[PDB]
Design a protein around this motif. Sequence first.
Motif, PDB file in Angstrom:
ATOM      1  N   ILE B 739       0.827  -1.202   0.000  1.00  0.00           N
ATOM      2  CA  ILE B 739       0.000   0.000   0.000  1.00  0.00           C
ATOM      3  C   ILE B 739       0.864   1.256   0.000  1.00  0.00           C
ATOM      4  N   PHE B 740       1.720   1.407   1.012  1.00  0.00           N
ATOM      5  CA  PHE B 740       2.458   2.652   1.194  1.00  0.00           C
ATOM      6  C   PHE B 740       3.458   2.890   0.066  1.00  0.00           C
ATOM      7  N   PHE B 741       3.937   1.819  -0.558  1.00  0.00           N
ATOM      8  CA  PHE B 741       4.909   1.915  -1.639  1.00  0.00           C
ATOM      9  C   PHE B 741       4.201   2.267  -2.940  1.00  0.00           C
ATOM     10  N   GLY B 742       4.639   3.352  -3.574  1.00  0.00           N
ATOM     11  CA  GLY B 742       4.090   3.763  -4.850  1.00  0.00           C
ATOM     12  C   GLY B 742       2.782   4.517  -4.787  1.00  0.00           C
ATOM     13  N   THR B 743       2.393   5.022  -3.616  1.00  0.00           N
ATOM     14  CA  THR B 743       1.133   5.745  -3.484  1.00  0.00           C
ATOM     15  C   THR B 743       1.337   7.084  -2.784  1.00  0.00           C
ATOM     16  N   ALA B 744       2.405   7.199  -1.998  1.00  0.00           N
ATOM     17  CA  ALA B 744       2.683   8.402  -1.215  1.00  0.00           C
ATOM     18  C   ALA B 744       3.237   9.556  -2.046  1.00  0.00           C
ATOM     19  N   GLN B 745       3.230   9.481  -3.379  1.00  0.00           N
ATOM     20  CA  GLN B 745       3.765  10.568  -4.191  1.00  0.00           C
ATOM     21  C   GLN B 745       2.878  11.806  -4.166  1.00  0.00           C
ATOM     22  N   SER B 746       1.611  11.665  -3.786  1.00  0.00           N
ATOM     23  CA  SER B 746       0.685  12.786  -3.749  1.00  0.00           C
ATOM     24  C   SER B 746       0.790  13.498  -2.400  1.00  0.00           C
ATOM     25  N   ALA B 747      -0.140  14.416  -2.136  1.00  0.00           N
ATOM     26  CA  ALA B 747      -0.151  15.174  -0.895  1.00  0.00           C
ATOM     27  C   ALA B 747      -1.390  14.926  -0.046  1.00  0.00           C
ATOM     28  N   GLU B 748      -2.347  14.133  -0.527  1.00  0.00           N
ATOM     29  CA  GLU B 748      -3.558  13.824   0.222  1.00  0.00           C
ATOM     30  C   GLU B 748      -3.479  12.470   0.921  1.00  0.00           C
ATOM     31  N   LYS B 749      -2.277  11.913   1.063  1.00  0.00           N
ATOM     32  CA  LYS B 749      -2.104  10.627   1.725  1.00  0.00           C
ATOM     33  C   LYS B 749      -2.001  10.743   3.239  1.00  0.00           C
ATOM     34  N   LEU B 750      -2.196  11.940   3.799  1.00  0.00           N
ATOM     35  CA  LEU B 750      -2.107  12.111   5.242  1.00  0.00           C
ATOM     36  C   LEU B 750      -3.374  11.669   5.962  1.00  0.00           C
ATOM     37  N   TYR B 751      -4.501  11.575   5.256  1.00  0.00           N
ATOM     38  CA  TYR B 751      -5.768  11.207   5.870  1.00  0.00           C
ATOM     39  C   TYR B 751      -6.385   9.945   5.282  1.00  0.00           C
ATOM     40  N   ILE B 752      -5.743   9.317   4.299  1.00  0.00           N
ATOM     41  CA  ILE B 752      -6.283   8.089   3.728  1.00  0.00           C
ATOM     42  C   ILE B 752      -5.689   6.849   4.397  1.00  0.00           C
ATOM     43  N   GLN B 753      -4.475   6.954   4.944  1.00  0.00           N
ATOM     44  CA  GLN B 753      -3.874   5.815   5.630  1.00  0.00           C
ATOM     45  C   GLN B 753      -4.565   5.532   6.958  1.00  0.00           C
ATOM     46  N   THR B 754      -5.075   6.571   7.623  1.00  0.00           N
ATOM     47  CA  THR B 754      -5.787   6.368   8.879  1.00  0.00           C
ATOM     48  C   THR B 754      -7.103   5.633   8.654  1.00  0.00           C
ATOM     49  N   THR B 755      -7.765   5.895   7.524  1.00  0.00           N
ATOM     50  CA  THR B 755      -9.049   5.255   7.254  1.00  0.00           C
ATOM     51  C   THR B 755      -8.884   3.763   6.994  1.00  0.00           C
ATOM     52  N   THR B 756      -7.928   3.388   6.142  1.00  0.00           N
ATOM     53  CA  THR B 756      -7.705   1.979   5.844  1.00  0.00           C
ATOM     54  C   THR B 756      -7.097   1.220   7.017  1.00  0.00           C
ATOM     55  N   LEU B 757      -6.414   1.915   7.929  1.00  0.00           N
ATOM     56  CA  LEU B 757      -5.894   1.254   9.122  1.00  0.00           C
ATOM     57  C   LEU B 757      -7.003   1.015  10.138  1.00  0.00           C
ATOM     58  N   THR B 758      -8.006   1.896  10.164  1.00  0.00           N
ATOM     59  CA  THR B 758      -9.108   1.744  11.109  1.00  0.00           C
ATOM     60  C   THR B 758      -9.960   0.524  10.780  1.00  0.00           C
ATOM     61  N   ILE B 759     -10.255   0.309   9.497  1.00  0.00           N
ATOM     62  CA  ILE B 759     -11.101  -0.818   9.114  1.00  0.00           C
ATOM     63  C   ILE B 759     -10.323  -2.126   9.195  1.00  0.00           C
ATOM     64  N   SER B 760      -8.994  -2.059   9.087  1.00  0.00           N
ATOM     65  CA  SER B 760      -8.189  -3.274   9.154  1.00  0.00           C
ATOM     66  C   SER B 760      -8.134  -3.820  10.576  1.00  0.00           C
ATOM     67  N   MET B 761      -8.078  -2.932  11.571  1.00  0.00           N
ATOM     68  CA  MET B 761      -8.053  -3.376  12.961  1.00  0.00           C
ATOM     69  C   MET B 761      -9.393  -3.974  13.374  1.00  0.00           C
ATOM     70  N   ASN B 762     -10.498  -3.382  12.913  1.00  0.00           N
ATOM     71  CA  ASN B 762     -11.815  -3.899  13.267  1.00  0.00           C
ATOM     72  C   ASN B 762     -12.078  -5.246  12.607  1.00  0.00           C
ATOM     73  N   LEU B 763     -11.638  -5.414  11.357  1.00  0.00           N
ATOM     74  CA  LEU B 763     -11.846  -6.680  10.664  1.00  0.00           C
ATOM     75  C   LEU B 763     -11.005  -7.798  11.267  1.00  0.00           C
ATOM     76  N   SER B 764      -9.795  -7.482  11.734  1.00  0.00           N
ATOM     77  CA  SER B 764      -8.947  -8.505  12.335  1.00  0.00           C
ATOM     78  C   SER B 764      -9.445  -8.910  13.716  1.00  0.00           C
ATOM     79  N   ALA B 765     -10.146  -8.012  14.409  1.00  0.00           N
ATOM     80  CA  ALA B 765     -10.671  -8.315  15.735  1.00  0.00           C
ATOM     81  C   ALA B 765     -12.039  -8.979  15.689  1.00  0.00           C
TER      82      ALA B 765
END
Lengths: 782, 782
Positions: B739-765
């Motif tokens: 995910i993080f590789f090849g996507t951080a070239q933009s400037a709006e990646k500061l608030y999209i990583q938190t969203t995908t990390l939030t759903i990943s923790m809930n799905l794993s639990a």
Amino acid sequence: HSIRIEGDVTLGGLFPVHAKGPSGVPCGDIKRENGIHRLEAMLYALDQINSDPNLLPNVTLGARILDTCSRDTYALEQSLTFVQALIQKDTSDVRCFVKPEKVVGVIGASGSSVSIMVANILRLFQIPQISYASTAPELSDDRRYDFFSRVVPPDSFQAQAMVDIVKALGWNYVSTLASEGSYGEKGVESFTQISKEAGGLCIAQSVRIPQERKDRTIDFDRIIKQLLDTPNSRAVVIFANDEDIKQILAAAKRADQVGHFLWVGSDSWGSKINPLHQHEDIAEGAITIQPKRATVEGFDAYFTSRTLENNRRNVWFAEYWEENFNCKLDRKCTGQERIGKDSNYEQEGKVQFVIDAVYAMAHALHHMNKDLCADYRGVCPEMEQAGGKKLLKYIRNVNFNGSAGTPVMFNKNGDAPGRYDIFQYQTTNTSNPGYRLIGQWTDELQLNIEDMQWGKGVREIPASVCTLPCKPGQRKKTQKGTPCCWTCEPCDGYQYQFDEMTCQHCPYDQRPNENRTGCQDIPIIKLEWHSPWAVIPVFLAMLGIIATIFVMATFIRYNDTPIVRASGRELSYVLLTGIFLCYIITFLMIAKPDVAVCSFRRVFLGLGMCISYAALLTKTYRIYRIFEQSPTSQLAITSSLISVQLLGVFIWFIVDPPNIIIDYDEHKTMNPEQARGVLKCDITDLQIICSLGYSILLMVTCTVYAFKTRGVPENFNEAKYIGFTMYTTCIVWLAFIPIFFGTAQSAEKLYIQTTTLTISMNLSASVALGMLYMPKVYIIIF
Amino acid sequence: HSIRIEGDVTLGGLFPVHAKGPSGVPCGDIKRENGIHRLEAMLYALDQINSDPNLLPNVTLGARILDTCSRDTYALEQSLTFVQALIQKDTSDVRCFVKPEKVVGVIGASGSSVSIMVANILRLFQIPQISYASTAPELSDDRRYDFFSRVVPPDSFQAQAMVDIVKALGWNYVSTLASEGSYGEKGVESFTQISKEAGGLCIAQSVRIPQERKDRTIDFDRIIKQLLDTPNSRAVVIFANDEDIKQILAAAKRADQVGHFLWVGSDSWGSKINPLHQHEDIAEGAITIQPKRATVEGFDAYFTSRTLENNRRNVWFAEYWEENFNCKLDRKCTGQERIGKDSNYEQEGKVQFVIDAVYAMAHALHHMNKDLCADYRGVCPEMEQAGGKKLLKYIRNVNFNGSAGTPVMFNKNGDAPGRYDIFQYQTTNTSNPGYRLIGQWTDELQLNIEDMQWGKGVREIPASVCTLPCKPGQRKKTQKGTPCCWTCEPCDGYQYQFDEMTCQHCPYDQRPNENRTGCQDIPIIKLEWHSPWAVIPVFLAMLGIIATIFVMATFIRYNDTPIVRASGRELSYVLLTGIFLCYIITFLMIAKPDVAVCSFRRVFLGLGMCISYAALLTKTYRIYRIFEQSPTSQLAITSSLISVQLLGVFIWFIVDPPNIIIDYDEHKTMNPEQARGVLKCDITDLQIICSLGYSILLMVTCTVYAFKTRGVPENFNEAKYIGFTMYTTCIVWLAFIPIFFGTAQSAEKLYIQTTTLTISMNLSASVALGMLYMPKVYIIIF
């Protein structure tokens, strides 16, 4: 009043016959050095012109001799008297006339102020004027004074000759001295202007000599102290009179001066014995410029033959005769005829000048008369109406030989060209103590350097350059100060000079030379086993080569006996190739080749390291399965992990190009002469750590596996041997990381990491080689 | 010849009585506009001076009236005639005298060249001179002409008044036009010099008007076409005569010009109706400068009362009478007495000038006589010997009222101050078609702007500024071109202007405004759950809160029945706290606090994750030991690894300070108005990866030990449950890395990583609690 000579054409004359005295009378006592001599010279010139049939054969030439009394207002009145005879119209008066006296030109105005005033009053009426004794540079502008000419060069040519001599001999420091009046100031001003226009010369001292008193003897000491402040300034110029230079020489002799700086003389100095008295030692080597002097033979014979009864036109001849012999008509003198015998008088140098002026005027008049009318024998009426700028133009374009050998001519400005001869005082080696001729100056400077030896030494002994040559191999130009003389400063030693005028930085990544000519680092640093500590790893590698000649020795013959068959034949072949593979790896890394051949060397330790532990990995797994409860299968599993190590270096090749760079920069300012250079291929700290870190994973697993294996009642010597080797390698791996970090801050770490890696690889294999050595000697005994 | 008046003190007089004609005769026909009128004015002035007992009571004043014939050489001869009477010493000739005629001053030299000649010829003899009609600016240098004075202002004051009017009204474009002679060229030269010295004005056109022919009518069209090239240049100045301006107006009318550029008049234009003809429309609004005119009453009555037999001193009065009435002694005239009746003559404006000059001379002479001697009734002998610079100094310091109302005075240079009145032509709406007075210029400019309108227009209708004032929020000064008019160019919109003259760059990290007054980025970007896609992770976190409200529900009561006792109570407490720990972690990361309080939030996911998997790690080892063949023991081993995770975040704080920085720079040039700002604490991609990688390292060692667990006939439902979860967890971890590789070239990646990390923790639990709560529902329904 004024001497009048009858003639169809006449020209005026201005001469300082008398001299100004008290404020009441305009002019009082008479002067003999310039009063009567010039009048007699002009009269003789007119007589020989009228006698000569070559110039003006059918027309005579008259003149109006007249005095100026050395006064500007009197000169104005006399010029008005000259011009009124042609300007005045009439006068409506009767008493109970004279010839019109049409003048064509004027010859006179010996002084400077009277010259300027006469030029100003006659420029409006368009009357040409030729001077003979006007040496002021102010009367040199054609626009300021249209109708004016001079037969004597001004002081500008003298200043030009002085600066040319200074430039040819070689000098930079000169001091200017001038006296009162309008002569020395104008001379030094022209000198400074010429020096500034030509360039290469500067003025370091500028003093003024007032004339408010003559019994002070303090200002001379002050100026000599001001001149003695800088010993570098050894050349001075003087534009003062004889009394000032005599007092200066006396003060220099009484002040006990040891430097003995040179002197440069002006026309006021000349070549006389009066300015020298007891100061021959300090005045030696003074370059003096004097105008050329020519002596005529006709004017002297003319003047020595005149008496009171011979000529009556001159009205001041009787007064001159009375004043010369000091006899008034209480001593009476009648018919002495000893003017050339009783008094040792000598003619002046300005007689030739007035003679040449009269010659030029007569030649111009003759040429104009010939060009205007040629079909009439006598005086044509056209010549009277024709006058003004034509006569001036004809005067400008004239060229002939006068009484002196040198010709006379006028340039664009209107003044005669300067011709001078350079003199010098020598009284040590020359037999004649008087001045000797060393060079002339007419149009180009011609000076004999080898013909002058002043101060009883070599010619070019004194130098004034503001500074030493300062040529140690590098030089820099400083804009601070005057561009005349420069200062040198030592720039940084990390670069060489550019164009011998600046210190610009040479490109980095090398070192400069010692002569500041090139910026290149020819010396290089190469690893040597004998010089560095690499001899011990090289000796350790040779020691391992002797040891491996024993493990494989008892392997060729012991291949079919029913003793070695207990060990796996496939496992024995794996360890045999692995031991020989690491032996070649330590040798390749020891050698440092500059060629692009290190790609085959990195795989010796990259891919050849996994094949060493490949036999150990499947060996523990083979002896562990029999405890939990196909030789070709054990060979395949090890062959797979070799492909992973082989493919690992392959993907690294396509990732980045294997660019090899041998250039290196020390970037150390502590030692500029030192140039450290290291040439390594693919120098990466993480690459060597990640490649060696791969074997750490499998080794850590084998260590825990061998630990649990301990205690099995299967082998006694074999189990004890494998237990100690799993505990000895972990020490050298754990210590390798501390030495790596916190040490790379220096620049000599390019050759110390290879030495410690070479010894570490050998010791990690000797413990295995020693572990294999124990069963070999055991089966030999048994 | 010349009029002679007897007197102890006399002063000269120069007047252009005659006019030059052919080349042969110096002066031919007589002129009445300046010939006899000035002579009669001077005679009347002398008469009223002699009659007035206030000035020179006991001493009379004479003069020598004389003509110049408008010739330079004739003027020089006539001026020399004045000085010769004193200069001439004697004349040594008899025929078979007159009073010395000592002159003190001279009044005349109306022209320019004759004025210069007289000044040059009288400067040497130190004789004062006062002119009345010399307007050339050349005779304004005190050093060039020492003894010279003027009662009429030169053209320099006129040019100063013109440039002052131009500056006051407001103009940038002016075109200079001049005629032949030495008047227009000097005027335009003085105008350009004053404009360059004062600054703020420039010259755009400079044309010359030759006078080689009068029947060409081509050069006028050429110059009007050259002037019509730039329509912005609407202001021109003219220094020509009346014929030139008349022809220019005729050409402009015949060319059908629509711009109608304004005109500026000179003294030659004045206020005269003759030049204007059919050009009232195009000549309207022309500013003309004319000298003030004053009419005397005594000189007219004096001139109208003289006849032939009344006065005999004037020698040209008979010729003037003959030429005026055209009668020679074939018409004879005897005693007409109609000089003021038959001819409608009018007195000139220069009569007051010569009257004021005579007044100033008489006043200076009277003051000098009073200061020199006061105890003598008549003429003291000291006055004759004293003369020269004293009389000039007394002339310079004079102040009185003459015939006109304005007084007369001399400045440091010696010329009279300029006094002019500004006129303007208005005919379209003015009650009188003649010129009207709008302002005066004596020492400071006094102009009435509202007084001049010229009909159907405001006084500031024309605009000449060379550039329209640009004020849209952008301005910049360009050095290219003349400093007269400035050109402004649109600089970059990422910065504001500095000092309204340049476009300097504002500091970064903040956008500029729209009016270019400040550079600051007031807007900011903050994460919002409703606006961004964070609503789904927030809803997923809320959905997870519903799930944990059911797992812990059947745990408080089911704690002593002999059904749950099969499961370990120590293990049940570990999973109970771990499930509640991750539920608080997902809520903390969702909230974004500005204060530096995220240190307590990073440990919720860093240390709270290890306690979640700690129960699963020891659960596998507990159920695996019973297969191979002390509840508080398993609690201690999991408590140890919690201390490792707790101490891991502690050493990170000692490594680097936990500084919180909220400032951010977008550094995007695509949209200057956009300002993207992101605020985060310890935002590091390696920090979040290394923290989450710790759980991945221990999970690999746990899944391998769970393979042998499958197939054990102890608890089929429990064994099948654990195996299903494992594959799901490694799936979300394997996808997290790409995910993080090849996507951080933009400037709006500061608030999209938190969203995908939030759903990943809930799905794993959720999958973890799903298999754990699976056997719990068995005792409920069954």
